[PDB]
Design a protein around this ligand. Structure first.
Ligand SMILES: O=C(O)c1cc2ccccc2o1
Ligand SMILES: [Cl-]
Length: 468
């Protein structure tokens, strides 16, 4: 009696699970929005910001008309190898957002110490991927790694058809700060990660004027076997692929059709991604160098680590942001913490979502969002950065773990505008000149040197219709 091999694993539910972490896939949580969870873990923040420079050169006539295709191919080539490293070492990739990825090892407090060792070793094997890596003309493209450990809160917000999630708290703030201290090839530990770590495993040096530390070496004791050590650590990793599924990168590759789970998971994913997953759109349609308008929205709180305080406020802002964006096919691409505030990366003019008068609409939407969010209880400061131009749109990461992302100088510009000009609506020259709006709607701003952007162009505050 025959026994045919290889289980079918290309279900729509599996394709949707690629765009999500295990934190979501295996989350099983209540309907209420906002939803909040509290746990401990180790965070890894890998920065690959050599490619926001690569985006510009891929726009040139060199690449003929295959710049977006060549860019996503070389990106994913490198990011796939980082993803595979994180996954094999037992991490959950939470999020991709142009310039970086965030990974989680969610673990009970007693196991934090040993898991930090696992995460450090993973970090050093990531750097070793790029030791003699390059693309000939210009540079060599390497990574920067910040690590943190401690209390982590999760926020889930949304409505009946859309869901978004965020990690929040001191370890989230710390991993971002650790990453900003890092140079090319560094592994930085947050002060608390250093306080919790196995100090007899790791050789560090002092970071100037900083409580955070730099890993120089992993020097394991005489009788230490990393493979045996890792095997002991997998005891505490709920979803580590094992036994008959030991060949898999993600347990999520084994998800079976489940209408109720799929209904809940599809809400995290953009309708155009779902269409491609459903084989109703060509799988290359979403990789594009495309003119868009970025509306970057930042919401500041008195304490950005207390999810019970800020979760209701983000939900309230989300509900209004979503109603305003739908009007013009605006999309929330990502939500995440900056080093100060919760930020919504909103996009006008994504593939098949182009409206006429994109710029006038992006500006009126920004002001609407600004005015509402300014009246939301616990929102201390709203800042909105508006920038317009050619950006890269595409699915970034590994086959088993990928996300739709925007990358480009105009993405970085909108982000830097909202941090360097807090409390106002700002826009670039493209938005200002190409707005179908009169000059007195705007105030021409002083020029600030912005860490990441070279000649921004003239910047403007969107003042709005009246003097008041
Ligand atoms: O460039 C950033 O600030 C950035 C990238 C990123 C990736 C995952 C989660 C948060 C993130 O923030
Ligand atoms: Cl996040």
């Amino acid at each position: 009696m025959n026994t045919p091999k290889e289980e079918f694993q290309d279900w729509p539910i599996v394709r949707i699970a690629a765009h999500l972490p295990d934190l979501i896939v295996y989350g099983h949580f209540s309907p209420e929005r906002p939803f909040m969870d509290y746990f401990d873990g180790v965070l890894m923040f890998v920065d690959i910001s050599g490619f926001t420079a690569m985006t510009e050169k891929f726009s040139s006539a060199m690449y003929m008309d295959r710049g977006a295709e060549q860019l996503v191919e070389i990106l994913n080539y490198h990011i796939s190898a980082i993803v595979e490293k994180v996954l094999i070492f037992g991490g959950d990739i939470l999020k991709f957002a142009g310039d970086a990825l965030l990974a989680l090892w969610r673990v009970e407090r007693k196991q934090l110490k040993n898991i930090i060792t696992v995460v450090i070793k993973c970090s050093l094997e990531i750097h070793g991927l790029f030791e003699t890596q390059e693309w000939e003309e210009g540079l060599d493209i390497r990574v920067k790694i910040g690590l943190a450990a401690g209390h982590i809160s999760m926020l889930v917000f949304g409505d009946e058809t859309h869901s978004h999630f965020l990690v929040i708290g001191q370890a989230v703030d710390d991993v971002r700060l650790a990453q900003n201290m890092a140079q090319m090839n560094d592994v930085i530990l947050s002060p608390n990660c250093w306080q919790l770590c196995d100090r007899s495993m790791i050789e560090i040096e002092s970071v100037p004027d900083q409580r955070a530390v730099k890993v120089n070496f992993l020097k394991p004791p005489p009788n230490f076997n990393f493979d045996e050590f890792f095997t002991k650590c997998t005891t505490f990793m709920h979803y580590y692929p094992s036994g008959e599924h030991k060949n898999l990168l993600r347990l999520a590759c084994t998800l079976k059709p489940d209408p109720e789970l799929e209904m809940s998971l599809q809400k995290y994913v953009m309708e155009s991604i779902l269409k491609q997953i459903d084989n109703k759109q060509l799988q290359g349609y979403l990789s594009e160098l495309r003119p868009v308008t970025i509306v970057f929205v930042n919401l500041m709180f008195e304490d950005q680590d207390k999810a019970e305080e800020i979760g209701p406020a983000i939900q309230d802002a989300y509900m209004h942001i979503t109603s305003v964006l739908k009007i013009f096919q605006g999309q929330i691409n990502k939500v995440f913490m900056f080093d100060k505030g919760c930020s919504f990366l909103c996009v006008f003019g994504f593939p098949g979502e182009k409206v006429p008068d994109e710029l006038t609409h992006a500006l009126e939407c920004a002001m609407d969002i600004f005015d509402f969010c300014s009246q939301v209880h616990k929102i201390q400061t709203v800042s909105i950065g508006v920038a317009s131009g050619i950006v890269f749109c595409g699915i970034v990461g590994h086959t088993v773990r990928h996300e739709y992302t925007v990358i480009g100088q105009k993405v970085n510009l909108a982000a830097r505008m909202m941090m360097y000009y807090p409390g106002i609506v700002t826009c670039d020259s493209v938005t200002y000149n190409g707005s179908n709006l009169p000059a007195y709607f705007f105030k021409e701003l002083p020029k600030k040197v912005m860490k990441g952007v070279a000649d921004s162009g003239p910047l403007y505050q969107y003042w709005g219709r009246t003097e008041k």
